[PDB]
Amino acid sequence: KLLLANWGLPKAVLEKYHSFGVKKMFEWQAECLLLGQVLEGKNLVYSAPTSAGKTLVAELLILKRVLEMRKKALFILPFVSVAKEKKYYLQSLFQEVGIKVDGYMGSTSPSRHFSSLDIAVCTIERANGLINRLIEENKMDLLGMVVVDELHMLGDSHRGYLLELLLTKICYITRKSASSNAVQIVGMSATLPNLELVASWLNAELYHTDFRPVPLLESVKVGNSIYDSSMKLVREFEPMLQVDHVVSLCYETICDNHSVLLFCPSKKWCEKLADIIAREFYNLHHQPPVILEQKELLEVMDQLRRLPSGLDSVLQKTVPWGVAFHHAGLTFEERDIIEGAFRQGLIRVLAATSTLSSGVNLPARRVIIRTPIFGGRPLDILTYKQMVGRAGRKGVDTVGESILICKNSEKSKGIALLQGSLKPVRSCLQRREGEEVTGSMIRAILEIIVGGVASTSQDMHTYAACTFLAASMGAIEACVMWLLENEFIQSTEKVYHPTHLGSATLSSSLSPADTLDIFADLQRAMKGFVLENDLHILYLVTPMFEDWTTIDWYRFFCLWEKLPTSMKRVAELVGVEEGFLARCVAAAAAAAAAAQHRQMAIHKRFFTSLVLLDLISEVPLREINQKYGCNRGQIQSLQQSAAVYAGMITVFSNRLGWHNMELLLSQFQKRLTFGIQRELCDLVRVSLLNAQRARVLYASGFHTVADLARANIVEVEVILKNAVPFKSARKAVDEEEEAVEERRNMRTIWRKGLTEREAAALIVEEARMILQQDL
Amino acid sequence: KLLLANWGLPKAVLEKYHSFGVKKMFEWQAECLLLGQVLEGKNLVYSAPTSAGKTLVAELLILKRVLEMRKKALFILPFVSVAKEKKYYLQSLFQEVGIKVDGYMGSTSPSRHFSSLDIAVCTIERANGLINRLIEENKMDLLGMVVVDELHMLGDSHRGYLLELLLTKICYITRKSASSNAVQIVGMSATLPNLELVASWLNAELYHTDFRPVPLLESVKVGNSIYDSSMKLVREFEPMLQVDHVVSLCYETICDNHSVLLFCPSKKWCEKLADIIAREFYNLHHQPPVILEQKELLEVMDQLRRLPSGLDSVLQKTVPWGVAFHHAGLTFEERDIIEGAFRQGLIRVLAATSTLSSGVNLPARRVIIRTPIFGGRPLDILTYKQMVGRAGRKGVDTVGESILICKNSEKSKGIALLQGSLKPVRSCLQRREGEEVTGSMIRAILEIIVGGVASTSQDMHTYAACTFLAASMGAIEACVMWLLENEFIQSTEKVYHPTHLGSATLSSSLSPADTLDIFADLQRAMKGFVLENDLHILYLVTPMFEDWTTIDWYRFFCLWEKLPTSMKRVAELVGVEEGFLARCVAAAAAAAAAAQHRQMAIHKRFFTSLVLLDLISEVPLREINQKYGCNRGQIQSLQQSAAVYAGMITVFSNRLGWHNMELLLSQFQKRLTFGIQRELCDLVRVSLLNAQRARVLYASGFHTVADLARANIVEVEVILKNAVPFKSARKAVDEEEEAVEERRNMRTIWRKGLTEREAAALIVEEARMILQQDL
DNA sequence: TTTTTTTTCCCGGG
DNA sequence: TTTTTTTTCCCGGG
């Protein structure tokens, strides 16, 4: 019955699942598994709370289908970290029978090909490209199941409409243009008010349940009253020690065994509340017991001290007690340790802005939401229900809590957020029909014409009848026109064929809207190209961010004047000019009408490209944030996104027909991949030896600094003298004084100390002193 | 004794040599072979007339040394064609025992490496690079013999001083810096007046002989008197039919069996005298017999008719009789047939400017030199003795003749040219000692410092004592300075080390003087580079010719105005400007003082680069000479020299340290190699199908035009539609009308007929008509 | 005044 | 108002 053994599973699979400690299944799982003909063929849509085991049925169905019919499967997931964890889980579970679970998430590309794989775990945007390729090459029939998580994002999002672009396409191509269920689709949502309409569109069943192992109480508190539930008093809060009374609330939670989670509305605000709690804990417990261990807490200090960026000041006066912060201004490795400590004991109190609301699974006891207004706007209903989902620890306590501290002035705002479920899911396509067509519809029809699925306008009119007309119920004729004067398709006397620009957009998969910006940058490049410095090629591969940081305009104008002579020639060629910056940095704003749109996009990518230049040329990170307004967590994200963008413009140029430019872009992929050196780490222990001098000195020495570095002085000086490019140091018959000086200040030893010969004696003398201390 | 069998030779070698029909050897060969200790070790220098067998001793010595001691050998030869003939001779002779005779001449690079070879046949400039590489890599000891032909060119020439740069270097490095003869050197000259001084410098023997199988008489004729020899009358010339009386002189030669050779002082002049003789032959022999065959003469007409350039008008009215011309304004294949006919019968009379004076071996009977003044200057003594050397046919007649037609006004000019032997050989280095150092000395010391043979100035002072001080008998100190401010070597506190620019010059081996021009062109390129068209990359690989044609300045200014918008941007970047051409083309000349030297070199390479652009883009050769003042023989030479130059700038950039530019230059080596298509020849039989459309149409059709071309019209139109690069056809927010139009006139079908769709119907209709005629 | 995520791929014998 | 000559190199299994 409910026992896992009485369900027909492989022996190794059941043993592995019992190793985790799961034996029974809830009645709702069985009810939804035996709901109609979901088990054999057909599609399924259901919505269950996240606290209850939700992936049981999905894994059972995918295992059944894979073991019965040999066909590939997809496991589209929202984020990367959850995708990696799910990939590890699936591999460790199917590590015996043999599936070769492999993930496409992030830059972790598969070592093998898609054909050898059986189950692929991908993100939202890395499955659309896979399906597009499976359409371009006639191998679509390999697909046998598509599993989608978090279905309600298909309505409206920055990247959630890809589900609505993908599902209709696969269903139409597999069934409507071909004629049991050839492709099975299952989905998960969160208590949608119109879940029936989604199931009918996909021709599926419908199961809705509401069962949680822990019955949490959303005990909203206002002032001293704990008026909650249906506006009824349950308890009265007394003023404990104070200097809102937030500190008193965490005290009773801290006492017995429990923990607190504070959701700040700002990063800094997390820091402010973290130090405040730390003061009270030490105030009257070191001069009731605080109940914390000290053997492992001091060990954690060691890990936080060995990071290259070093420990943080606010992370030293609060970590000794169970207080810290987990905002986004931390290194991915540094922020991982804070999460690890909360996983089992040690730290007790925590703070966060939004990171632990979606992306990680860290349950705890009663959760404080603090103010009910975030960023000057009312809190979203979906966000509030997401935070309170993590207000219960499974298998330890019996009940959960969720106390929202709302000021007496507002009052009704908490009640409105307390009373409400969700909103109906829109289409994003609907918006306008006779007005300007949305960017989602333009990408919809262009992405099948390039694949050749639909050629005649009559055929494509059928396609639009399977995505939105049956969903919740001219535009096509106006959408075809937009693709015409923009040179995306070509028309004969009525058959449409892809052009070279249309094929380039699909292969690289940027967008049918931002491709018009990258194309204008590459076309302007083939009229003059600076080849001495590496800034003009760093401007064509810089990632395009809508808003990644508050671009300071006073500092940008300051760095504009101090640029060298050679690097100022790239600026005039790419488009950035001083006149625009004169109007800006003077309490200005954006504008419209085409021409002003190009000006803002040109200047925004230059500031990002300037930052990326310094990371290639060292410029230690402590001084990076001093000159450029940035953050430690933002710098790391830029490095990851720069490598992916460099290798994607290369595909754009290859399909476009331009072959000479492609070689230049492909050659630069090596330098942008920073990585971490391991063998060179021993050689990098020298003061005046950067990463660029390791390779040249490794050819001869390839040893430590004690005896290898103490081998003559002429050989060492000459070896590093010939590594630099030529860079002649005499004025030509057409150059200027500034041009030659920039060619003379580059050969100086760096940073930028003495002359060439003087550094040879300094390096040898410094090495001898270091050798004596070591020995 | 004199028999070849009694000399100790391999049986196969002697049988092969007897196959050619050579049995005995003259007494001078034995005398020079048994002269001192030349046979075992030591060096040899001798001078013999070219008519007598001169290579017997050289081949005997090289065979002896190779068969005795396993060591490589070199056979430096002046020209390429003679080098190829010598390579074929040596291979066919040593085709049995096993030597692997292989030549470096021209672009015919070896398939294997130098180590596997045993005997290498190289030109003058392709052995200096080999020796430089054998110095750079410590493998000099493989050399065991160096054979030099035409030694007297070492004195003064445009490229003859390389022998004086090479011999001293090898001798010094092998003997003076190391301590029997480790390396044996043999040489051939032509009756030098100071041959003793050359032998003592190389520490060799000396043999001088004067013996010719045919005793030619230099019967100079002036007016009607044949006053010759020591100014003595031998015969009186009577006036035969006339309209100088040049035609009458050839008549008696033509009659019995003999032939005539006329050395014109100009190309055209050869044409003028060729038609004149043809008129007289037909005048009174078709209305004594002319004595010529007609079966093979008509066959020769067929070969001259199938050339791509077609037959020549002046080559049709004189070829029916034994008259033609052999100037340099002919294709290498076309001019080969004329030489082949003269090899055995058929054609009897011939004309030439200088081609048959040095480079080919075509002996004949009495030779007429015509005027004794060439190009407004007195005839060179060496040139006159070179022409009369071919005034005797071996094995047919008994005596030769050489009649120089000198007008009665000059008279003494012929006597001075008749009485005289040669002039003493200079050094080219001597010229000036305290004055500006010659370009030969700068290259001399730079070429050993880079190799590291000499480091201290004391050591190098010894080097100059082995090349010229002992030859025919401050400069070194002034020569080192010139290499200093020009950044060719670097100096320490006295030891000199090569720089990056110095190593680049030796590897590519242009010159220590013209490298300063190529470097200034590449440095100017890394400040802006046009990547759309292929003219900016065609300007950096254009061969640098001192004077290859009379550059017309009126037409150059005309083509300057008609250039498109994109191609005029390259002109401003490279240096060519309208202002300079305004002063020129107005009865102007050259100038001096550095700045004017760069201006002339910039503009001269642009005219050559414009010509090379059309050859890549078809532009049939008949119209090539109409717009550009050129010649059929000059166009072919430009194509051969362009391919070699493209692959040599690549080596220059690799050693210089600039890696991004090297990739662009290396990618262009493929297009510059025109070649001849063989498989595509069948596909090229279509009117509207050039070489670029063969590859795209070969993917689908790959057949003839009868049935393969008659396969639908949409498929054919689309296939050639997508081959062109994108080349968008809409004006951008920053472009101009002219820029867009140049992007719209390129997609038109070419040439440059109807629109894109119209050509599809025209091609199909034209193919059907051609198919009907064939079938 | 916070939270994310695209691309194709070379090395060994010669 | 004619006659010449430099350079290093990739393709197959995956």
Swiss-Prot record, chains A, B:
Effect on the protein upon substituting residue 54 to M: Abolished ATPase activity
Region (Helicase activity): 35-464
Transmembrane segments: none
Start and end residues of each Helicase ATP-binding domain: 35-210
Motif (DEAH box): 149-152
Processing and modification events after translation: Phosphorylated by PLK1; promoting interaction with TOPBP1 and recruitment to DNA damage sites.
Distribution of this protein across tissues and organs: Highly expressed in testis.
Annotated Helicase C-terminal domain residues: 244-464
Region described as Interaction with RAD51: 734-775
Cell compartment(s), UniProt: Nucleus; Chromosome
Binding sites annotated in the UniProt record for ATP: 29, 48-55
Subunit-structure text: Homomultimer; forms homodimers and homotetramers. Interacts with RAD51. Interacts with ORC2 and ORC4. Interacts with RHNO1; interaction takes place during mitosis and promotes POLQ recruitment to DNA damage sites. Interacts (when phosphorylated) with TOPBP1 (via BRCT domains 7 and 8); promoting POLQ recruitment to DNA damage sites.
Family per record: Belongs to the DNA polymerase type-A family.
Domain remark text: The loop 2 region is involved in the binding of the 2 ends of resected double-strand breaks and homomultimerization.
Biological role: Low-fidelity DNA polymerase with a helicase activity that promotes microhomology-mediated end-joining (MMEJ), an alternative non-homologous end-joining (NHEJ) machinery required to repair double-strand breaks in DNA during mitosis. MMEJ is an error-prone repair pathway that produces deletions of sequences from the strand being repaired and promotes genomic rearrangements, such as telomere fusions, some of them leading to cellular transformation. MMEJ is required during mitosis to repair persistent double-strand breaks that originate in S-phase.
Disease: Breast cancer: A common malignancy originating from breast epithelial tissue. Breast neoplasms can be distinguished by their histologic pattern. Invasive ductal carcinoma is by far the most common type. Breast cancer is etiologically and genetically heterogeneous. Important genetic factors have been indicated by familial occurrence and bilateral involvement. Mutations at more than one locus can be involved in different families or even in the same case.
Protein name: DNA polymerase theta
Full-protein interval shown: 68 to 891 of 2590
